Amino acid sequence: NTKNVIRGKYHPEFLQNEVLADIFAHTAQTLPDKTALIEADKTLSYGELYQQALIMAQHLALKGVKPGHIVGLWLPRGIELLKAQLAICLSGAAWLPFDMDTPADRIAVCLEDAEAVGMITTDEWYEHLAEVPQTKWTNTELQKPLSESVSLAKTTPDQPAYIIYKPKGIVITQKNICHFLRSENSILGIQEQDKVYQGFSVAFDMSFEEIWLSYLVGATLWIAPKSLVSDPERLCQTLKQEQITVLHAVPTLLALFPEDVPNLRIINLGGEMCPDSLVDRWALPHHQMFNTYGPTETTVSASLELLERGKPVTIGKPLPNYGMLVINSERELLEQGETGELCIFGPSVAQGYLGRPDLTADKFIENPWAMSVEEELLYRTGDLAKIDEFGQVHCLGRA
Ligand SMILES: NCCC[C@@H](N)C(=O)O
Ligand SMILES: [Mg+2]
C-alpha cells in the first residue's frame, strides 16, 4: 500500500491489437459519406479521404515505402496536408511532420537524422528543397491513377507511428498513440456529431488531439488557414460562425478572445497551466473546460484536469492507464510529500529518442515498481513535483 504512486483509471480495453490505420479505416468504412474535412468551402468525406489516401499509399508502396520506414511531411495547412499524413499512415510507415515555417536545412537535418526514405511536399514547395538529398515526392504525383491495385503491407503496434523533432527525434509507436487516443477520449468524449477546429501545425502534439480523436469517433474537421491562426478576434468570430463544438488551444489564445463562443462543447487547454482569471472567464455552465498536461515523450498528454470557477487549477489526475511517481537523485521512489523528479509510466511512454541511445537510456529507465508489463518504463520529465495530501501531483518548476 503506497500513496506515493498515482495511477489513472484502470482500462485494459484501451490497449487493443491495433494501429492508426486500423482506427481510421474503421471510421471511414463505418461512415463513408460523413464529411471528414472542411477547408473554406471545399469538403471531403471520410470515404473520399480514405480512397484518395489509399491511392497515395499504394503509390508510396510502389516507390518502396514499407512498414517501419519514416516519411517526411511538409505541406501547407489544408486538406492536402492531412490527406498526405493519412497516406503515409496507410502505407504502414511513420511520418515526420514539419511546420509550415521550417527552413530547408532543418528539414535536411531531420531527414538525415531519422534516416528517412523520403518526404512528401507540393510542386510549389518542391523547388525550395534543392539542398535536401532525400527523395522528394509530390502529393500530385502520388495521386495519379493506378493501372492495378497494390497490396499494402500492414504495420505492427511496436512500429513507429510518427517522430516529433541538436535535433531530438522522439519515437512514438502505433501502440503509444492508439492507446493515448482511446485513453484521453474516454474522458474528453469527442463525439461524431462534433465539429472540431483544426488550427494546430502538424508538428505539435495538440494537432493529434485535434485530428485523430476526430478520426477515432468520426467528427468533422474545419481546417484553419494560416491567415486565421494569428487573428484571435477573427478566430473568435469564425468559431461562432461555423458553430464549432470542439476547440483545442493554449490558454493565451483563449485569453485573447473578445467574447464568449457559447456553442463550444469541449474546450481543451494544453500547452500551459490555465490561469485562474481565464478559468473564471470561461469555466461556464455550457462549457466543459479542460487542462491537459504531458510531455511529448509520453504521447501528447499524460494528465487531464476539469476546470471549474473557484476550484484551484492543478495538472489533474493521470489519464487512464497512465501513472506518475516522484523519484530523487538516486533514481529511487520517494514517500509522499518529499519533492523530486516527476516520472511517468504506462503504455504510452515513447520508445525513446531516435538514434541517441545515450540520452534515451538516461531518461527512459527501468521501473522497479511496475505492477504490470505496461508500467516497466519510466520517463523522467526533468520537472520537479510533489504529491500532496489529496493524492494530487503539483509541479514545482524545472530541475
Ligand atoms: N496536451 C499537451 C500539450 C502539448 C505538450 N505535450 C507539448 O509538448 O507541446
Ligand atoms: Mg516535451
What does the DSSP assignment read for 306-334?
E--TTSPP---EEPTT-EEEEE-TTS-BP
> Which residue CA neighbors atom 4 of ligand 1 most closely?
271
Asked if residue 74 belongs to a domain, the reply is yes
Q: How far apart are CA 60 and CA 139, in angstroms?
A: 10
Q: How far apart are CA 292 and CA 271, in angstroms?
A: 8
Residue listed under C-alpha cell 456529431:
193
Asked if residue 339 belongs to a domain, the reply is no
Q: How far apart are CA 172 and CA 354, in angstroms?
A: 10
Please calculate the CA angle 40-43-47 and round it to the nearest 5 degrees: 155
Report CA-CA distances (Å) from 192 to 217, 220, 324: 5, 7, 31
Report CA-CA distances (Å) from 59 to 168, 221, 245, 246: 30, 26, 36, 34
Q: Which residues pair with 96 in a beta bridge?
A: 72
The answer to whether 217 and 195 are in contact (CB under 8 A) is: no
Asked if residue 371 belongs to a domain, the reply is no
Check if 204 has its Cβ closer than 6 Å to any atom of ligand 1: yes
Q: Quick one: cell of 189? A: 468524449
Q: How far apart are CA 246 and CA 290, in angstroms?
A: 11
Asked if residue 80 belongs to a domain, the reply is yes
Distance of CA 32 to the CA centre of its chain: 24
Residues in contact with 69: Cβ distance below 8 Å, sequence separation at least 6, in sequence order = 92, 93, 94, 116, 117
Please calculate the CA angle 301-304-308 and round it to the nearest 5 degrees: 150
Q: Is 294 annotated as a binding residue?
A: yes
Distance 291 CA to ligand 1 centre (A): 11
Q: Which domain holds residue 65?
A: 16-313
Specify the 3-state DSSP secondary structure of 26.
helix
The answer to whether 180 and 18 are in contact (CB under 8 A) is: no
Specify the 3-state DSSP secondary structure of 132.
coil
Check if 270 has its Cβ closer than 6 Å to any atom of ligand 1: yes
Check if 292 has its Cβ closer than 6 Å to any atom of ligand 1: yes
Q: How many other C-beta atoms lie within 10 A of the C-beta of residue 255?
A: 16
Ordered alpha helix ranges (H), 70-168: 79-90, 104-114, 123-126, 139-142
Q: How far apart are CA 314 and CA 13, in angstroms?
A: 28
Approach to solving = X-ray
Report CA-CA distances (Å) from 5 to 184, 206, 293, 332, 342: 20, 27, 18, 12, 11
Residues in contact with 331: Cβ distance below 8 Å, sequence separation at least 6, in sequence order = 365
The answer to whether 146 and 254 are in contact (CB under 8 A) is: no
Q: Which residues pair with 37 in a beta bridge?
A: 44, 221
Asked if residue 145 belongs to a domain, the reply is yes
Q: Quick one: cell of 299? A: 504521447
Ligand 1 atom, smallest distance to 268 CA: 1
Q: How far apart are CA 46 and CA 35, in angstroms?
A: 6
Q: What backbone phi and psi angles, to 5 degrees, belong to 197?
A: -70, 130
Specify the 3-state DSSP secondary structure of 56.
helix
DSSP 86-106: HHHHHTT-EEEE--TT--HHH
Q: How far apart are CA 212 and CA 255, in angstroms?
A: 25
- Closest ligand, as measured to the CA of 291: 1
What's 137's domain CATH number? Answer: 3.40.50.12780
Query: Nearest-CA neighbor of 87 among 53, 58, 60?
Result: 53
Asked if residue 10 belongs to a domain, the reply is no
Asked if residue 22 belongs to a domain, the reply is yes
Check if 290 has its Cβ closer than 6 Å to any atom of ligand 1: no
Query: Nearest-CA neighbor of 14 among 318, 369, 306?
Result: 318
Pairing of strands 323-327, 195-198: unpaired
Q: How far apart are CA 243 and CA 258, in angstroms?
A: 17
Task: Fill in the DSSP letter of residue 300.
Answer: S
Check if 296 has its Cβ closer than 6 Å to any atom of ligand 1: yes
Check if 174 has its Cβ closer than 6 Å to any atom of ligand 1: no
Q: How far apart are CA 260 and CA 386, in angstroms?
A: 35
Report CA-CA distances (Å) from 234 to 225, 241, 256, 258: 12, 10, 11, 10
Amino acid identity for residue 252 in this structure: T
Distance 154 CA to ligand 2 centre (A): 30
Residue 390: exposed, middle, or buried by beta-carbon count in 10 A (0-12, 13-18, 19+)?
exposed
Q: Is 300 annotated as a binding residue?
A: yes
Check if 213 has its Cβ closer than 6 Å to any atom of ligand 1: no
Residue listed under C-alpha cell 514517500:
335
Q: Quick one: cell of 164? A: 516529433
Ligand 1 atom, smallest distance to 295 CA: 6
Ligand 1 atom, smallest distance to 209 CA: 1
Q: Is 250 annotated as a binding residue?
A: no
DSSP 188-218: H---TT-EEEE-S-TTSTHHHHHHHHHHHHT
Q: Is 301 annotated as a binding residue?
A: yes
Distance 233 CA to ligand 2 centre (A): 29
Q: Which residues pair with 97 in a beta bridge?
A: 73
Q: Is 123 annotated as a binding residue?
A: no
Counting ligand 1 atoms within 8 A of each CB, the residue from 296, 304, 379, 395 with the most, and so the one to mutate, is 296
Q: How many other C-beta atoms lie within 10 A of the C-beta of residue 352?
A: 20
- Closest ligand, as measured to the CA of 379: 2
Asked if residue 372 belongs to a domain, the reply is no
Q: How far apart are CA 4 and CA 22, in angstroms?
A: 37
The answer to whether 75 and 122 are in contact (CB under 8 A) is: yes
Task: Fill in the DSSP letter of residue 127.
Answer: G
Distance 308 CA to ligand 2 centre (A): 26
Task: Fill in the DSSP letter of residue 135.
Answer: -
DSSP 233-299: HHHHHHHHHHT--EEEE-HHHHHT-SS--TT-SEEEE-SSPPPHHHHHHH--TT-EEEEEE--GGGS
Helix (H) / strand (E) element for 48: namely helix 46-62
Distance 269 CA to ligand 1 centre (A): 10
Resolution (A): 2.5
Q: Quick one: cell of 101? A: 515555417
Distance 316 CA to ligand 1 centre (A): 15
Report how many domains make up the chain: 1
Q: Is 292 annotated as a binding residue?
A: yes
Q: How far apart are CA 216 and CA 223, in angstroms?
A: 17
